[PDB]
Amino acid sequence: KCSLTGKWTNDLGSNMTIGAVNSRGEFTGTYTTAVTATSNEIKESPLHGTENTINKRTQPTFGFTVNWKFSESTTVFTGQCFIDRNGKEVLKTMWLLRSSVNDIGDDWKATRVGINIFTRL
Amino acid sequence: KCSLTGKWTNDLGSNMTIGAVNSRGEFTGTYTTAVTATSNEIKESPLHGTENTINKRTQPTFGFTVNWKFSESTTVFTGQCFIDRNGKEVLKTMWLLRSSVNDIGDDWKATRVGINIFTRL
Amino acid sequence: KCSLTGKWTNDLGSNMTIGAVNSRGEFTGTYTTAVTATSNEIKESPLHGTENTINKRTQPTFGFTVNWKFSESTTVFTGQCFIDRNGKEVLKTMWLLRSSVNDIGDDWKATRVGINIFTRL
Amino acid sequence: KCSLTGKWTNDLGSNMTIGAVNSRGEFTGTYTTAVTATSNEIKESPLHGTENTINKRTQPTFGFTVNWKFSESTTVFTGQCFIDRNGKEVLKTMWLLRSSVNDIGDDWKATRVGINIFTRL
Numbered sequence: 001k002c003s004l005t006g007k008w009t010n011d012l013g014s015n016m017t018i019g020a021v022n023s024r025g026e027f028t029g030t031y032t033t034a035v036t037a038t039s040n041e042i043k044e045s046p047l048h049g050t051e052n053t054i055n056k057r058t059q060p061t062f063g064f065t066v067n068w069k070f071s072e073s074t075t076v077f078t079g080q081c082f083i084d085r086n087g088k089e090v091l092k093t094m095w096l097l098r099s100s101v102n103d104i105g106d107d108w109k110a111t112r113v114g115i116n117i118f119t120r121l
Numbered sequence: 122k123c124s125l126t127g128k129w130t131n132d133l134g135s136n137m138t139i140g141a142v143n144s145r146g147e148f149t150g151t152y153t154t155a156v157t158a159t160s161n162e163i164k165e166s167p168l169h170g171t172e173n174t175i176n177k178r179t180q181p182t183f184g185f186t187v188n189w190k191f192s193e194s195t196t197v198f199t200g201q202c203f204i205d206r207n208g209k210e211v212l213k214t215m216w217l218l219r220s221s222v223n224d225i226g227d228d229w230k231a232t233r234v235g236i237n238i239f240t241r242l
Numbered sequence: 243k244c245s246l247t248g249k250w251t252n253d254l255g256s257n258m259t260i261g262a263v264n265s266r267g268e269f270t271g272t273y274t275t276a277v278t279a280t281s282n283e284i285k286e287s288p289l290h291g292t293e294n295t296i297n298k299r300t301q302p303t304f305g306f307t308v309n310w311k312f313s314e315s316t317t318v319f320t321g322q323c324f325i326d327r328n329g330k331e332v333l334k335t336m337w338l339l340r341s342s343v344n345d346i347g348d349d350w351k352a353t354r355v356g357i358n359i360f361t362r363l
Numbered sequence: 364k365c366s367l368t369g370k371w372t373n374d375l376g377s378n379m380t381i382g383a384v385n386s387r388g389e390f391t392g393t394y395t396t397a398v399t400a401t402s403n404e405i406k407e408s409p410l411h412g413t414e415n416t417i418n419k420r421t422q423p424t425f426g427f428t429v430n431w432k433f434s435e436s437t438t439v440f441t442g443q444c445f446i447d448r449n450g451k452e453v454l455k456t457m458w459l460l461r462s463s464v465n466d467i468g469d470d471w472k473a474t475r476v477g478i479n480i481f482t483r484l
């Protein structure tokens with residue numbers, strides 16, 4: 001009932017497209033953000049993830065990594081695909097954004113955390 | 122200099138094997154835990170991820186998703202491959218563990234966070 | 243311009259009252275939830291925290307700890323008091339929920355993470 | 364058996380002192396870090412927290428906020444006081460570091476996450 005395939009937009013205005021999910025639950029996609037004002041446009045970064053196929057849940061958990069094309073950073077997202085109080089699909093996710101640091105002594109401050117909610121575009 | 126390919130063990134005793142990383146930074150492997158019980162014995166779950174290839178860093182960031190085979194949960198891990206002060210390779214990671222919930226009203230309690238440090242096996 | 247003192251409600255329906263903030267940035271208050279059951283009905287737990295007073299910012303950061311009265315758990319919340327784009331006060335927060343575990347070997351799964359957004363009641 | 368009162372040091376070399384905990388579980392302390400090389404010394408910031416007193420656990424959960432004196436940031440810590448495989452006390456904590464941002468549009472990148480382990484000084 002809740003399928004990851006398709007076009008999504010989030011609460012900060014980023015968009016993401018996800019292709020077909022195979023029988024192993026693997027999928028690829030693209031992740032688009034602004035930077036920043038009306039002016040001007042965008043960066044596209046690839047994403048790769050898997051949805052959990054245990055018990056063929058109608059609302060499966062999933063995870064994906066975005067391999068940023070314009071920085072040395074990586075973000076991972078994890079969450080669950082829900083049906084809301086009737087019909088519309090919603091991805092409730094949390095993410096970790098990992099910055100590159102040059103010294104292992106700075107490792108402690110390299111990880112940001114937050115949320116995103118996605119709806120169909 | 123720090124390469125994800127190979128066998129790793131962490132601070133809680135789980136092991137992980139990662140395969141070759143392709144020119145897009147993509148890799149697959151397997152994640153093994155313990156400590157359930159048995160006279161052994163373990164579970165093996167596949168993982169899929171990407172290493173960031175921007176500026177061909179010697180200590181790249183990376184993320185991967187573990188698609189648990191024995192539960193409806195997903196974990197994502199993000200971190201950086203370092204050469205430590207002592208010259209040995211280490212993966213400093215943080216993870217989010219997403220539990221499946223039945224109602225979107227329980228979404229708030231579905232995410233655990235923690236760390237893992239990996240060294241070569 | 244954004245002051246923590248007063249009554250707040252969040253996105254999950256919990257309410258919070260915060261008292262006066264003293265010259266050191268210290269405050270006390272109460273945190274109320276739902277949605278257990280009853281014909282009511284609620285639990286009230288005390289909270290204690292500090293607002294950062296450096297540079298007398300109009301949108302200060304702050305943290306507080308809620309000492310749950312009905313469990314062995316603790317939550318900490320950190321965030322910033324903003325004047326939103328629409329001119330209304332909002333607390334954008336993130337929290338960690340620490341569960342009590344009996345063995346130090348289960349420490350790895352004792353921490354949940356999430357967000358809460360508060361507006362004036 | 365595990366009491367928060369006393370002098371502690373962590374895995375990054377920060378120290379913290381915590382005073383007496385009252386009957387409500389409230390405590391104050393001081394949090395000291397370096398910045399950075401042998402040269403030279405330190406900053407001291409106050410801390411305020413509470414330990415959970417439910418079921419008078421020998422290994423209670425606790426939380427505290429550090430109100431940084433040299434920045435507009437706030438950190439909160441939550442964790443549990445353990446006795447380890449015999450006699451020595453250990454605080455296993457996780458933290459959220461909240462940076463001040465000027466626009467609510469940057470709120471999403473304002474929170475870092477990590478761990479600290481403390482032992483008696």
Ligand SMILES: Nc1nc(=O)c2ncn([C@H]3C[C@H](O)[C@@H](CO)O3)c2[nH]1
Nearest residue numbers: 133135154192194196216218236237
């Ligand atoms: N080793 C290890 N380190 C982690 O950080 C971690 N985070 C989650 N998990 C796995 C464990 C269960 O398979 C599974 C429980 O569904 O979650 C982890 N395992």
Ligand SMILES: Nc1nc(=O)c2ncn([C@H]3C[C@H](O)[C@@H](CO)O3)c2[nH]1
Nearest residue numbers: 254256275313315317337339357358
């Ligand atoms: N409203 C609200 N928002 C949170 O982010 C949050 N995080 C933790 N908790 C509280 C709820 C239970 O009292 C208690 C369960 O021990 O944890 C929260 N309550």
Ligand SMILES: *[C@@H]1O[C@H](CO)[C@@H](O)[C@H](O)[C@H]1NC(C)=O
Nearest residue numbers: 013014015032033034042121
């Ligand atoms: C997301 O998609 C819509 C088009 O449907 C567009 O208006 C907007 O510019 C997009 N946002 C980004 C970050 O590209």
Ligand SMILES: *[C@@H]1O[C@H](CO)[C@@H](O)[C@H](O)[C@H]1NC(C)=O
Nearest residue numbers: 134135136153154155163242
């Ligand atoms: C990890 O590998 C080592 C072999 O070096 C083995 O002793 C250990 O039991 C393995 N752990 C798991 C969880 O399989």
Ligand SMILES: *[C@@H]1O[C@H](CO)[C@@H](O)[C@H](O)[C@H]1NC(C)=O
Nearest residue numbers: 255256257274275276284363
């Ligand atoms: C929060 O306060 C409002 C009154 O504005 C009340 O309707 C609601 O039930 C309260 N929630 C809780 C959890 O007490």
Ligand SMILES: *[C@@H]1O[C@H](CO)[C@@H](O)[C@H](O)[C@H]1NC(C)=O
Nearest residue numbers: 376377378395396397405484
């Ligand atoms: C912590 O305490 C010890 C003294 O016991 C000292 O060597 C060290 O400088 C301290 N570290 C900091 C950050 O002050």
